[PDB]
Design an enzyme around this catalytic site. Sequence first.
Site, mmCIF file in Angstrom:
data_model
loop_
_atom_site.group_PDB
_atom_site.id
_atom_site.type_symbol
_atom_site.label_atom_id
_atom_site.label_comp_id
_atom_site.label_asym_id
_atom_site.label_seq_id
_atom_site.Cartn_x
_atom_site.Cartn_y
_atom_site.Cartn_z
ATOM 1 N N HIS A 156 1.541 -36.385 39.481
ATOM 2 C CA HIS A 156 0.745 -35.580 40.090
ATOM 3 C C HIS A 156 0.783 -35.592 41.491
ATOM 4 C CE1 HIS A 156 -3.309 -36.800 38.056
ATOM 5 N NE2 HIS A 156 -3.201 -37.825 39.026
ATOM 6 N N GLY A 190 -9.275 -39.574 43.934
ATOM 7 C CA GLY A 190 -8.144 -40.384 44.228
ATOM 8 C C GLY A 190 -8.470 -41.934 42.970
ATOM 9 N N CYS A 208 -6.987 -41.638 40.106
ATOM 10 C CA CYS A 208 -5.494 -41.752 39.550
ATOM 11 C C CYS A 208 -4.666 -42.922 40.102
ATOM 12 C CB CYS A 208 -4.970 -40.410 39.269
ATOM 13 S SG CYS A 208 -6.276 -38.889 39.354
HETATM 14 C C1 LIG Z 1 -13.006 -36.064 39.462
HETATM 15 C C2 LIG Z 1 -11.307 -37.199 39.413
HETATM 16 C C3 LIG Z 1 -11.941 -37.667 37.956
HETATM 17 N N1 LIG Z 1 -10.733 -38.537 37.238
HETATM 18 C C4 LIG Z 1 -9.345 -37.468 37.515
HETATM 19 C C5 LIG Z 1 -9.478 -36.879 38.701
HETATM 20 C C6 LIG Z 1 -10.459 -35.815 39.322
HETATM 21 N N2 LIG Z 1 -10.231 -34.977 39.737
HETATM 22 C C7 LIG Z 1 -9.908 -34.012 39.345
HETATM 23 C C8 LIG Z 1 -10.083 -32.216 40.265
HETATM 24 C C9 LIG Z 1 -10.209 -32.824 41.300
HETATM 25 C C10 LIG Z 1 -9.897 -31.682 42.069
HETATM 26 O O1 LIG Z 1 -11.230 -31.451 42.677
HETATM 27 N N3 LIG Z 1 -9.402 -30.619 42.746
HETATM 28 C C11 LIG Z 1 -9.199 -29.589 42.475
HETATM 29 C C12 LIG Z 1 -8.980 -28.854 44.015
HETATM 30 N N4 LIG Z 1 -8.703 -28.880 45.753
HETATM 31 C C13 LIG Z 1 -9.092 -27.690 41.919
HETATM 32 C C14 LIG Z 1 -10.666 -28.564 42.297
HETATM 33 C C15 LIG Z 1 -10.525 -33.780 42.010
HETATM 34 C C16 LIG Z 1 -9.744 -35.421 41.460
#
Ligand SMILES: Cc1cnccc1N1CCC(C(=O)NC2(C#N)CC2)CC1
EC number: 3.4.19.12
Lengths: 304, 304
Positions: free
Chosen positions: A41, A143, A145
């Site tokens: 991803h 960040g 990941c």
């Molecule tokens: C917090 C987290 C923890 N561990 C893995 C990934 C994580 N998040 C996933 C969602 C992401 C995000 O905010 N994506 C969008 C945008 N722009 C669609 C809203 C941020 C990172």
Amino acid sequence: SGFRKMAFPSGKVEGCMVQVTCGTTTLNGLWLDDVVYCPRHVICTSEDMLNPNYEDLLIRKSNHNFLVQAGNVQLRVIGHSMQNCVLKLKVDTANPKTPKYKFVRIQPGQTFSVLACYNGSPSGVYQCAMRPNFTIKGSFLNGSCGSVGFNIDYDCVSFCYMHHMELPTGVHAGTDLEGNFYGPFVDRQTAQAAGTDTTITVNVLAWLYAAVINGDRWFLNRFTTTLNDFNLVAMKYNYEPLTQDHVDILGPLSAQTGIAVLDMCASLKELLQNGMNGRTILGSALLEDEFTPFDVVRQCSGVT
Amino acid sequence: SGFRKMAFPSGKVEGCMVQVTCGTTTLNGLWLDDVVYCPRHVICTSEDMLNPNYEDLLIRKSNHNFLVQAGNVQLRVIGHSMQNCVLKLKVDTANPKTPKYKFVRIQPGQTFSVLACYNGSPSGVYQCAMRPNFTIKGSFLNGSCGSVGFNIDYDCVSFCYMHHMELPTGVHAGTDLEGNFYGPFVDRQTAQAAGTDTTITVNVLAWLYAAVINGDRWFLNRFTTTLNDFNLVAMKYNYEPLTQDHVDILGPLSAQTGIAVLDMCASLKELLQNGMNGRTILGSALLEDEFTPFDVVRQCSGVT
Ligand SMILES: Cc1cnccc1N1CCC(C(=O)NC2(C#N)CC2)CC1
Ligand SMILES: Cc1cnccc1N1CCC(C(=O)NC2(C#N)CC2)CC1
């Protein structure tokens, strides 16, 4: 004495963490030999994550669109391929700090250490377990990941987890280092709900043995039970069924304490039925299930 | 999201651990530049530990009686001296892996990471706190002495603890890296009882802020309080008094959540008076006090 939630020393894994950037997406990679492993991803725009066609998105990417930085030095990408949900970025330089390593796929209830990283830089290390519903309860921000989970046997790092996803309920999903998700989860921003987070019974029993070895003895009672009787109570309390295989694994701890496994099960049965009554075991007011029997022996014997 | 008891990455400290043997006593040393630091009780026989005269015992020791091994390579000892409760063994080789470092003496309530070692070899890393009674609740077996506690600010390791002793009650005592014990403890096998292990209030409040940031919100109530009113309840529950200095430190977390510090104190007051009623906060059934406000900001912001 004393009993702590202990992670493996992280140095061997710190030596493998790199930053991977593709377009505007940055996360972590794991650099072993001349391959960097990272979540596929990395190639997604926030829009892409809703229903991403990874084969199609990957066509638009070349080796030079994968920016791999190790410390403040750029690595040359000479190949890339997708394996399940990971990318393997071939670089022209073998990691000089590559430890002895294996890729292993763990079973629910197995514990491992996570080296939480951002931009290729280690932030912290913590211990967790693969839950029975194939989630982990981590600490991961944007960040994180590509941060990895591992175990160490002396000088061999067994990598068992790479972080990919946070579910809408704030629990975590990821892959082994062949890119296969644990459990039913996918690398898409969609409705994925976790199943029952049952308690890892064999691990609770191990921890109760650790408690006895470290002087916390108040919960030991005058009772015994059978696997079948215990399992009726475990079921009622959303505990994993205890198998003869688990009884066999708790053998060495049984031997060390002189408490028969089924006697400890009967102590656990009373704790489930009676609660702790405001008391603590090894500084916990709940029954801890993120120590395996091997963890308890390892920590109680001082393996390095 | 998610909130874990997180240690610092241990690699920079792993690179400094050595084995120190004197006669039949083996424990760990910390190798920084051309000095190895270790507990002075390395020179003691089990008999010596009852009422040891360290100046007198040390007279019988020469440089060549201190065997220092780094991996499987012997270091040449060219000087030794006693500073308080540590020995400084001058070696002829600067540690090539010496990180940027400081020696700091921490205050009760401050957290740090321990790299538990045996025979100079890292076994595990865990987070703990300097308790208000100047003990720590570690995980230390025979030969863990000389294991160290530290914090990392980016690339600078601040060493704050070296393990020396386990009290008869299974809690731990040790020194800063100038060899001064935390609290009233001595390096002798004698009656040393710890005082009240009070709860680190400012740290509980930080952790309640972490809970709100990570979605655990059930304990937030409709009340506020004053420092004086809160402190009457803290006193009753063996919590450390909350000072305006602590309120100031919780400022950044107050700002991030919009929950006034005194409102969170009133939520804590109700939790103390009412208990958890079988509920959990960040997976705990007790109020966690081994996260400082700085820890909570660091983990909630992803500092590397
Ligand atoms: C917090 C987290 C923890 N561990 C893995 C990934 C994580 N998040 C996933 C969602 C992401 C995000 O905010 N994506 C969008 C945008 N722009 C669609 C809203 C941020 C990172
Ligand atoms: C367990 C521990 C943890 N952390 C630091 C030190 C620790 N031990 C202190 C007592 C030692 C001992 O058994 N000494 C005697 C002998 N022979 C007098 C009995 C063993 C090591």
